[PDB]
Coordinates of C-alpha atoms and ligand atoms in Angstrom, one line a residue:
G1 CA 63.0 -50.6 -7.1
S2 CA 64.3 -49.2 -10.8
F3 CA 65.6 -45.6 -9.1
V4 CA 68.2 -46.4 -6.6
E5 CA 69.4 -42.9 -7.5
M6 CA 66.7 -41.4 -6.7
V7 CA 65.4 -43.5 -3.1
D8 CA 66.1 -41.4 0.0
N9 CA 66.9 -38.4 -1.0
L10 CA 64.6 -37.1 1.1
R11 CA 65.4 -35.6 5.1
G12 CA 63.1 -33.8 7.2
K13 CA 60.0 -34.2 9.3
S14 CA 56.0 -33.5 9.1
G15 CA 56.5 -30.4 11.5
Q16 CA 58.8 -28.4 9.2
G17 CA 58.8 -29.7 6.2
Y18 CA 60.6 -32.3 3.5
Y19 CA 63.3 -31.3 1.4
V20 CA 65.9 -31.7 -1.4
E21 CA 69.1 -30.9 -2.4
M22 CA 69.0 -29.1 -5.7
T23 CA 72.2 -26.8 -7.2
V24 CA 71.6 -23.4 -8.7
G25 CA 74.1 -21.2 -10.7
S26 CA 77.1 -21.5 -12.6
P27 CA 79.3 -22.7 -10.8
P28 CA 76.7 -25.0 -8.9
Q29 CA 75.5 -23.5 -5.6
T30 CA 74.3 -26.3 -3.2
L31 CA 70.8 -25.4 -1.5
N32 CA 68.3 -27.3 0.1
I33 CA 64.7 -26.9 -1.0
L34 CA 61.4 -27.7 0.9
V35 CA 59.3 -30.1 -1.2
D36 CA 55.8 -28.4 -1.3
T37 CA 53.1 -29.8 -3.8
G38 CA 50.8 -26.8 -2.2
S39 CA 52.0 -23.7 -4.2
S40 CA 53.9 -23.4 -7.8
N41 CA 56.8 -21.1 -7.4
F42 CA 60.5 -22.3 -7.2
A43 CA 62.0 -19.6 -4.5
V44 CA 65.6 -19.3 -2.8
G45 CA 66.8 -17.1 0.1
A46 CA 68.6 -14.8 -1.5
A47 CA 69.9 -12.4 1.3
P48 CA 71.5 -12.6 4.7
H49 CA 68.3 -14.0 7.1
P50 CA 69.3 -15.0 10.2
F51 CA 67.3 -18.8 10.0
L52 CA 69.6 -19.1 7.0
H53 CA 73.2 -20.2 6.6
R54 CA 73.8 -19.9 3.0
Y55 CA 71.8 -18.6 0.3
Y56 CA 71.7 -18.0 -3.4
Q57 CA 74.7 -15.2 -4.7
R58 CA 73.6 -14.8 -8.5
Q59 CA 76.6 -12.1 -8.6
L60 CA 78.7 -15.1 -8.3
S61 CA 76.7 -17.2 -11.0
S62 CA 77.8 -16.9 -14.7
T63 CA 74.0 -17.9 -16.5
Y64 CA 71.9 -16.1 -14.1
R65 CA 69.5 -14.0 -16.4
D66 CA 67.6 -10.9 -14.4
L67 CA 64.0 -10.5 -15.6
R68 CA 64.0 -7.5 -14.2
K69 CA 60.4 -8.1 -12.5
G70 CA 59.3 -8.5 -8.9
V71 CA 57.1 -11.0 -7.5
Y72 CA 55.5 -11.2 -4.0
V73 CA 53.5 -14.8 -2.2
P74 CA 51.5 -14.9 0.3
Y75 CA 51.0 -18.3 1.7
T76 CA 48.5 -19.2 4.5
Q77 CA 51.5 -19.0 7.0
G78 CA 54.4 -16.8 6.1
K79 CA 55.2 -14.6 2.9
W80 CA 58.2 -13.6 1.5
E81 CA 59.0 -11.0 -1.5
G82 CA 61.5 -11.3 -4.7
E83 CA 63.2 -10.7 -7.9
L84 CA 62.9 -13.2 -10.6
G85 CA 65.6 -14.6 -12.4
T86 CA 66.0 -17.4 -14.5
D87 CA 69.4 -20.1 -13.9
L88 CA 70.8 -23.6 -14.5
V89 CA 69.0 -25.8 -11.7
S90 CA 69.9 -29.7 -11.1
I91 CA 69.4 -32.0 -8.4
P92 CA 72.2 -34.2 -7.3
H93 CA 70.2 -37.4 -6.5
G94 CA 67.9 -36.9 -9.1
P95 CA 68.1 -37.4 -13.0
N96 CA 71.2 -36.3 -14.4
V97 CA 70.0 -33.5 -16.2
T98 CA 70.1 -29.5 -16.1
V99 CA 67.3 -27.3 -17.1
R100 CA 67.0 -23.9 -17.4
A101 CA 64.2 -22.2 -15.0
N102 CA 62.4 -19.4 -13.0
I103 CA 63.3 -18.5 -10.0
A104 CA 62.2 -16.1 -7.5
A105 CA 65.0 -14.9 -5.1
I106 CA 63.7 -14.0 -1.8
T107 CA 64.9 -10.5 -0.6
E108 CA 62.6 -10.0 2.5
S109 CA 60.3 -12.6 4.2
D110 CA 58.1 -13.2 7.1
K111 CA 57.1 -16.5 9.2
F112 CA 58.2 -18.0 6.4
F113 CA 62.1 -19.6 6.6
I114 CA 62.2 -22.3 9.5
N115 CA 64.8 -22.3 12.6
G116 CA 66.5 -25.3 12.3
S117 CA 64.4 -26.9 9.5
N118 CA 67.6 -27.1 7.2
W119 CA 65.8 -25.3 3.8
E120 CA 66.9 -22.9 2.8
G121 CA 64.1 -22.2 -0.3
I122 CA 60.7 -23.9 -1.9
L123 CA 60.0 -25.8 -4.3
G124 CA 56.3 -25.6 -6.1
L125 CA 55.4 -28.5 -8.0
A126 CA 51.7 -27.5 -8.4
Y127 CA 50.4 -26.3 -11.7
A128 CA 51.1 -23.0 -13.0
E129 CA 47.3 -21.0 -12.8
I130 CA 48.8 -20.9 -9.3
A131 CA 52.2 -19.4 -9.9
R132 CA 52.7 -15.8 -9.0
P133 CA 52.6 -13.1 -10.3
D134 CA 50.3 -14.8 -12.9
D135 CA 50.2 -18.2 -15.1
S136 CA 52.9 -17.1 -17.9
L137 CA 55.4 -18.0 -14.8
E138 CA 56.6 -21.7 -15.7
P139 CA 56.8 -23.9 -12.9
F140 CA 59.6 -25.7 -12.2
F141 CA 58.3 -28.8 -12.9
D142 CA 57.1 -28.0 -15.9
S143 CA 60.4 -26.6 -17.4
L144 CA 62.0 -30.3 -16.2
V145 CA 59.1 -32.0 -18.5
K146 CA 59.6 -29.8 -21.8
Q147 CA 63.1 -29.2 -21.9
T148 CA 63.9 -33.3 -21.2
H149 CA 62.8 -36.5 -21.9
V150 CA 61.9 -36.7 -18.2
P151 CA 58.1 -38.2 -18.0
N152 CA 55.4 -36.0 -16.7
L153 CA 55.1 -37.6 -13.4
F154 CA 57.5 -37.3 -9.9
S155 CA 56.0 -39.6 -6.7
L156 CA 55.9 -38.9 -3.0
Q157 CA 57.2 -41.1 -0.1
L158 CA 57.5 -38.8 3.0
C159 CA 59.0 -40.6 5.9
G160 CA 58.2 -40.1 9.7
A161 CA 60.0 -41.7 12.7
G162 CA 57.3 -42.4 14.8
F163 CA 59.2 -40.9 17.2
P164 CA 61.1 -37.4 18.0
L165 CA 64.6 -37.3 15.9
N166 CA 66.9 -34.3 17.9
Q167 CA 68.8 -31.8 16.0
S168 CA 71.6 -34.2 14.5
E169 CA 69.5 -37.0 14.1
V170 CA 67.2 -35.0 12.0
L171 CA 70.4 -34.3 10.0
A172 CA 71.1 -37.8 9.8
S173 CA 68.1 -39.9 8.8
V174 CA 66.7 -40.5 5.8
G175 CA 63.1 -38.8 5.2
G176 CA 61.9 -40.1 2.2
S177 CA 61.7 -40.3 -1.1
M178 CA 60.9 -38.0 -4.0
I179 CA 61.3 -40.1 -7.4
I180 CA 61.3 -37.8 -10.7
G181 CA 59.8 -39.6 -13.5
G182 CA 58.1 -42.4 -12.4
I183 CA 57.7 -44.9 -9.5
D184 CA 59.6 -47.2 -7.4
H185 CA 58.2 -50.1 -6.4
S186 CA 59.8 -51.1 -2.9
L187 CA 58.4 -48.0 -1.6
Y188 CA 55.2 -49.1 -0.9
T189 CA 53.0 -52.6 -0.8
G190 CA 49.8 -54.0 -2.1
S191 CA 48.4 -52.0 -5.1
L192 CA 48.2 -48.2 -6.1
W193 CA 44.5 -47.0 -6.8
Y194 CA 44.4 -43.8 -8.4
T195 CA 42.2 -40.9 -8.0
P196 CA 41.0 -38.0 -10.7
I197 CA 42.8 -34.9 -10.3
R198 CA 39.6 -32.5 -10.9
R199 CA 41.4 -29.5 -12.1
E200 CA 45.1 -28.7 -13.0
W201 CA 45.6 -26.1 -10.5
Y202 CA 46.5 -27.8 -7.0
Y203 CA 46.6 -30.8 -7.0
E204 CA 42.5 -31.0 -5.9
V205 CA 40.8 -34.3 -5.5
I206 CA 37.4 -35.1 -4.5
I207 CA 36.4 -36.9 -1.0
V208 CA 33.5 -39.2 -1.2
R209 CA 32.8 -40.7 2.6
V210 CA 34.8 -40.1 5.7
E211 CA 34.7 -42.8 8.3
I212 CA 36.0 -42.6 12.4
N213 CA 36.5 -46.7 13.2
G214 CA 34.6 -47.8 10.1
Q215 CA 31.4 -45.5 11.1
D216 CA 30.3 -43.3 8.4
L217 CA 31.0 -39.2 9.5
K218 CA 27.4 -38.8 8.0
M219 CA 27.7 -35.7 6.0
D220 CA 26.6 -33.9 2.6
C221 CA 30.1 -35.3 0.7
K222 CA 30.2 -31.8 -0.8
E223 CA 30.9 -30.5 2.9
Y224 CA 34.4 -32.8 2.7
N225 CA 35.3 -30.5 -0.5
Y226 CA 33.8 -27.4 0.8
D227 CA 35.9 -25.0 -1.0
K228 CA 38.2 -27.4 -2.5
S229 CA 40.3 -30.5 -1.2
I230 CA 43.8 -30.5 -2.1
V231 CA 46.7 -32.8 -1.9
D232 CA 50.1 -30.7 0.1
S233 CA 53.2 -31.9 0.9
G234 CA 53.9 -28.3 2.6
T235 CA 51.0 -28.4 5.2
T236 CA 51.7 -30.4 8.4
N237 CA 48.3 -31.3 9.2
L238 CA 45.5 -32.8 8.0
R239 CA 43.4 -29.5 7.7
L240 CA 39.1 -29.6 7.6
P241 CA 37.0 -27.5 6.8
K242 CA 35.0 -26.1 9.8
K243 CA 32.2 -27.9 9.5
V244 CA 33.8 -31.2 9.0
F245 CA 36.4 -30.6 11.5
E246 CA 33.8 -29.9 14.3
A247 CA 32.0 -33.7 13.5
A248 CA 35.5 -35.0 12.9
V249 CA 36.2 -34.1 16.5
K250 CA 33.8 -35.5 18.4
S251 CA 33.3 -38.6 16.8
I252 CA 37.1 -38.7 17.3
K253 CA 36.4 -38.0 21.1
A254 CA 33.7 -40.5 21.3
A255 CA 35.5 -42.9 19.9
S256 CA 38.7 -42.6 22.5
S257 CA 36.6 -41.7 25.6
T258 CA 38.0 -43.8 27.4
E259 CA 40.8 -41.0 28.0
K260 CA 39.9 -37.5 28.4
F261 CA 42.4 -34.6 26.5
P262 CA 42.2 -30.5 27.3
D263 CA 40.9 -28.6 24.9
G264 CA 44.3 -27.4 24.5
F265 CA 45.0 -30.8 22.9
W266 CA 42.3 -30.8 20.4
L267 CA 42.9 -27.2 19.3
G268 CA 46.5 -29.1 18.1
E269 CA 47.9 -26.4 20.7
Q270 CA 49.1 -28.5 23.4
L271 CA 51.1 -31.9 23.4
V272 CA 50.0 -34.5 26.1
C273 CA 52.5 -37.1 27.4
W274 CA 52.2 -40.8 28.0
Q275 CA 55.4 -42.8 30.6
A276 CA 57.8 -44.6 28.0
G277 CA 56.1 -46.3 25.5
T278 CA 52.5 -46.7 26.8
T279 CA 51.0 -44.6 24.5
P280 CA 47.5 -45.8 23.6
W281 CA 47.1 -45.9 20.4
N282 CA 44.2 -48.3 20.5
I283 CA 42.2 -46.0 21.7
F284 CA 42.1 -43.4 18.9
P285 CA 40.5 -44.9 16.2
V286 CA 41.8 -45.0 12.4
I287 CA 40.1 -42.5 9.8
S288 CA 39.0 -43.5 6.5
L289 CA 38.7 -41.2 3.7
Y290 CA 36.9 -42.2 0.4
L291 CA 38.4 -40.7 -2.9
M292 CA 36.8 -41.1 -6.4
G293 CA 37.6 -43.4 -8.5
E294 CA 38.9 -43.7 -12.0
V295 CA 35.7 -46.0 -13.0
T296 CA 32.6 -44.3 -13.1
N297 CA 30.2 -45.4 -10.2
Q298 CA 33.4 -46.7 -8.0
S299 CA 35.7 -45.4 -5.3
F300 CA 38.5 -46.6 -3.4
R301 CA 39.6 -45.7 0.4
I302 CA 43.0 -44.5 2.4
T303 CA 42.9 -45.2 6.1
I304 CA 45.5 -43.6 8.6
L305 CA 46.1 -44.5 11.7
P306 CA 46.7 -42.4 14.7
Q307 CA 50.5 -43.0 14.6
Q308 CA 49.8 -40.9 11.5
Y309 CA 47.4 -37.8 13.2
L310 CA 49.1 -37.8 16.5
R311 CA 52.9 -36.0 15.5
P312 CA 55.7 -37.0 17.8
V313 CA 57.0 -33.7 19.7
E314 CA 59.9 -33.7 22.2
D315 CA 58.6 -33.3 26.0
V316 CA 58.8 -29.4 27.4
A317 CA 61.3 -31.1 29.5
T318 CA 63.0 -33.5 27.7
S319 CA 62.1 -36.2 29.6
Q320 CA 61.3 -40.1 28.4
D321 CA 57.5 -39.7 28.2
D322 CA 56.2 -40.3 24.7
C323 CA 54.2 -37.3 23.5
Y324 CA 52.7 -35.5 20.5
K325 CA 50.2 -33.1 18.9
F326 CA 47.1 -34.0 17.5
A327 CA 47.6 -33.6 14.1
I328 CA 44.0 -32.1 12.8
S329 CA 43.4 -28.9 12.2
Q330 CA 39.9 -26.2 10.8
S331 CA 40.6 -24.9 7.6
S332 CA 38.6 -21.9 5.7
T333 CA 40.3 -23.0 2.9
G334 CA 38.9 -26.6 1.9
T335 CA 40.9 -29.7 2.6
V336 CA 44.2 -29.6 2.8
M337 CA 45.6 -33.4 3.1
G338 CA 49.1 -32.6 4.5
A339 CA 52.2 -34.0 5.8
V340 CA 51.2 -36.3 8.4
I341 CA 48.3 -38.4 6.2
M342 CA 50.7 -38.4 3.3
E343 CA 53.1 -39.8 5.9
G344 CA 51.1 -42.8 5.3
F345 CA 51.2 -43.1 1.5
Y346 CA 53.2 -43.7 -1.1
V347 CA 51.7 -40.8 -3.4
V348 CA 52.2 -40.4 -7.2
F349 CA 51.5 -37.5 -8.8
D350 CA 50.9 -38.5 -12.7
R351 CA 50.7 -35.6 -14.3
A352 CA 50.5 -37.4 -17.5
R353 CA 47.2 -39.3 -16.7
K354 CA 45.7 -36.6 -14.8
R355 CA 45.5 -38.7 -11.5
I356 CA 46.5 -39.1 -8.2
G357 CA 47.6 -42.6 -6.5
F358 CA 47.9 -43.8 -3.1
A359 CA 49.8 -47.4 -2.0
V360 CA 50.2 -48.1 1.7
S361 CA 54.0 -47.5 2.3
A362 CA 56.6 -49.3 2.9
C363 CA 58.0 -46.9 5.6
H364 CA 54.4 -45.3 7.2
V365 CA 54.5 -45.9 11.9
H366 CA 52.2 -48.8 13.0
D367 CA 52.1 -51.0 15.8
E368 CA 51.4 -55.0 15.8
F369 CA 47.1 -54.9 14.9
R370 CA 46.8 -51.7 13.1
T371 CA 48.3 -50.7 9.7
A372 CA 47.6 -48.4 6.8
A373 CA 45.6 -49.2 4.3
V374 CA 44.3 -48.1 0.7
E375 CA 41.3 -50.4 -0.1
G376 CA 38.6 -51.0 -3.2
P377 CA 36.2 -50.9 -5.0
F378 CA 33.4 -49.5 -3.7
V379 CA 30.0 -48.5 -5.4
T380 CA 29.7 -45.0 -4.7
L381 CA 27.4 -43.4 -6.8
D382 CA 27.0 -39.2 -7.8
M383 CA 30.1 -38.4 -6.8
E384 CA 30.6 -35.9 -8.9
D385 CA 28.0 -34.1 -6.5
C386 CA 30.6 -34.0 -4.2
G387 CA 32.8 -31.2 -5.5
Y388 CA 31.6 -28.0 -4.6
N389 CA 31.4 -25.1 -7.7
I390 CA 31.8 -21.2 -6.3
Ligands
314_401 C1 53.7 -23.6 10.2 C2 54.8 -23.4 9.5 C3 54.4 -23.8 8.1 N1 53.5 -25.2 8.6 C4 55.0 -26.3 9.1 C5 55.9 -26.8 8.2 C6 55.4 -27.1 6.6 C7 52.8 -25.8 8.8 O1 52.1 -26.9 8.4 C8 51.5 -24.6 8.1 C9 50.9 -24.7 8.2 C10 49.5 -23.6 7.7 C11 48.7 -22.9 8.0 C12 49.8 -23.3 6.5 C13 51.2 -23.6 5.6 C14 51.2 -23.3 4.2 O2 50.9 -22.4 3.7 N2 51.9 -24.1 3.3 C15 52.5 -23.1 2.2 C16 54.2 -23.8 2.2 C17 54.7 -23.0 2.9 C18 55.4 -23.9 4.4 C19 56.4 -23.6 5.0 F1 57.5 -24.2 5.5 C20 56.3 -22.1 5.4 C21 55.7 -21.5 4.3 F2 54.9 -20.1 4.9 C22 54.7 -22.3 3.6 C23 52.0 -24.5 1.2 O3 51.8 -24.1 0.0 C24 50.2 -24.4 1.2 C25 49.6 -22.5 1.2 C26 48.4 -22.0 0.4 C27 48.2 -20.7 -0.1 C28 48.7 -20.2 -1.6 C29 47.8 -20.8 -2.2 C30 48.2 -20.6 -3.9 C31 50.0 -20.1 -4.1 C32 50.8 -20.3 -3.2 C33 50.1 -20.1 -1.6 C34 47.7 -23.5 -0.3 C35 47.7 -24.1 0.1 N3 49.7 -24.9 -0.1 C36 52.0 -24.3 6.0

């Protein structure tokens, strides 16, 4: 591991998001910031809010510059409105550099901030094409690269605990690593496999085959990427296109048929509980997603365990049972490889080479009988036809 200063710099959990500490302004104002590969705006609370115990105070920064422009960002979830400006930004446990970046000062929000998440802003790591108001508002990472010698690459190790973290525990626990400008080899086991970034807007990829316990879901591969497939640390669940979700759930139910679960469970709404330590991991199937490789006609697969797709939650009675929610949801906007999927892997966002790498995470949760995997190569034909065109 060659980036010790950035190892273990993340905190949080899949259900509330993973955040990194950052400073804004002069003198520096410390804020916790949501790491989001699914959007492209850097924004921070800048006014009192019931869920914020701190916020960006522009009048206290000598380096604050007002852009005299409003900004509106609607996510799938919530939304916020703010005021554009620029200021000096640093990452304490990151590259030892300070850059001038665009910052949206959040003045109004709805269903955006999360009670108890301990974060006060968001770091959109995707491309300018999806930045608001438009692509002229340079994303933070683009600024970082243009202004310094930091390599145009970052990598994420999101670490799920495999069990519930109470409010005090989640504040003291290491939630992962964001390596800015490199790849730290102590964060994964095995080899890194790369899939092409199809287009530079979201981190878009192409899925070419899906298996549930080795059984081919057998859908036209174009269905898996309808209307796109993205890697998104800012969304908890693995979200699948309506038709794919319906097929996947039918197959996961069939594989786990020795136990009957209520419809509310499969809807990702209600928790299921087992007596302490008795969770029947073995009755649930592994899920394999095959991704386009960098070599013509070649693919590789990433395999996740139910320890990734079943999300640990505290029992509504705080008892001693081990409880979970089904972390796979239907989508109307394409496949979203969310945080619960990223928890099984070390993910390399290699912007410079327009590719995303996957390797088994040194912190993925598993059991003595099964482990997550990244395996290849597989001969796969016509993978370009798996991509959706509007
Ligand atoms: C329930 C609260 C959020 N949450 C738990 C904690 C992560 C989720 O699992 C979740 C669920 C759904 C259905 C959507 C999003 C969602 O919209 N996430 C976005 C980031 C986010 C995190 C939060 F923490 C609260 C929020 F407002 C928002 C992400 O950028 C998402 C936005 C999408 C819409 C978009 C497109 C282009 C540009 C901007 C936004 C595109 C895919 N990425 C997030």
